[PDB]
């Protein structure tokens, strides 16, 4: 068993998709 | 919609295999 | 002359700041 | 204050440099 691999997912996932809204909008500005 | 998407994408995904890991040895260090 | 150069390095200081503070207190979460 | 910081600066880092790079090439179609 390994719940901090899966865990480690979620919380990873969560700071990916936070990045793209960012970069998103911020790479948005230039093009 | 254009490249800023595909762009902050690429990004997200590396940072995400990036935060993936250090998790990893977050919850090592207690699990 | 470069403004992308210098005007480049603003933006992805922005995210860098921001990302310490999400990973900061993700990372605090664990420890 | 812990590892939980060390680890959040070496991301921030990382992913800055990672940014550093698209913003270069997102001014590059239109500078």
Same sequence: chains 1, 2, 3, 4.
Wanted: net charge neutral; charged share 45%.
């Amino acid at each position: 068993r390994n719940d901090a691999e899966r865990l480690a997912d979620e919380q990873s996932e969560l700071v990916k998709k936070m990045v793209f809204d960012t970069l998103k909008d911020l790479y948005k500005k230039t093009t």
